[PDB]
């Protein structure tokens, strides 16, 4: 019943979502180039802000421990970029 709530994708919507995902991946791949940090860390912070405050933990593989403080610092360093960055 919980699975029958999310509608089935149309081909257009499917390609849309997939494209957005890939574009996101590349975007992070360049964001790491701009900030000179870590791709996994950045994408994990983006994930954090996307999912909300319900899910916040230290991910095995990331060097920094993901607490709201640190993700706030990083998010503020993400807001400290030029419009084209």
């Amino acid at each position: 019943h919980e699975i029958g709530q999310v509608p089935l994708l149309t081909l257009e919507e499917e390609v849309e979502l997939a494209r957005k995902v890939e574009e996101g991946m590349e975007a992070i791949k360049k964001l790491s180039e701009i900030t000179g940090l870590d791709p996994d860390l950045i994408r994990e912070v983006v994930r954090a802000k996307i999912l909300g405050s319900a899910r916040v933990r230290h991910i095995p593989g990331l060097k920094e421990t993901l607490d709201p403080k640190t993700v706030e610092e990083i998010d503020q360093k993400l807001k400290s970029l030029p419009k084209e960055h």
């Binding site: 081909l11 257009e12 390609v15 849309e16 494209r19």
Partner: protein, 52 residues
């Protein structure tokens, strides 16, 4: 179509009108599912700008 500047010349019993006209010619594009429209509604575009 609208007329910006309208000039004229009196010749005999007639007039020769020099009109500066402006208008819009519609062109229909068909979009395929694998394609993505990257231009909003009523967006002013120029020559070379990517629409889809």
């Amino acid at each position: 179509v609208r007329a910006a500047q309208v000039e004229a010349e009196e010749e005999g019993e007639t007039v020769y009108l020099t009109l500066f006209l402006e208008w819009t010619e519609p062109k229909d594009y068909r979009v395929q599912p694998h394609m993505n429209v990257v231009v909003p509604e009523g967006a002013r575009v120029e020559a070379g700008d990517k629409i889809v």
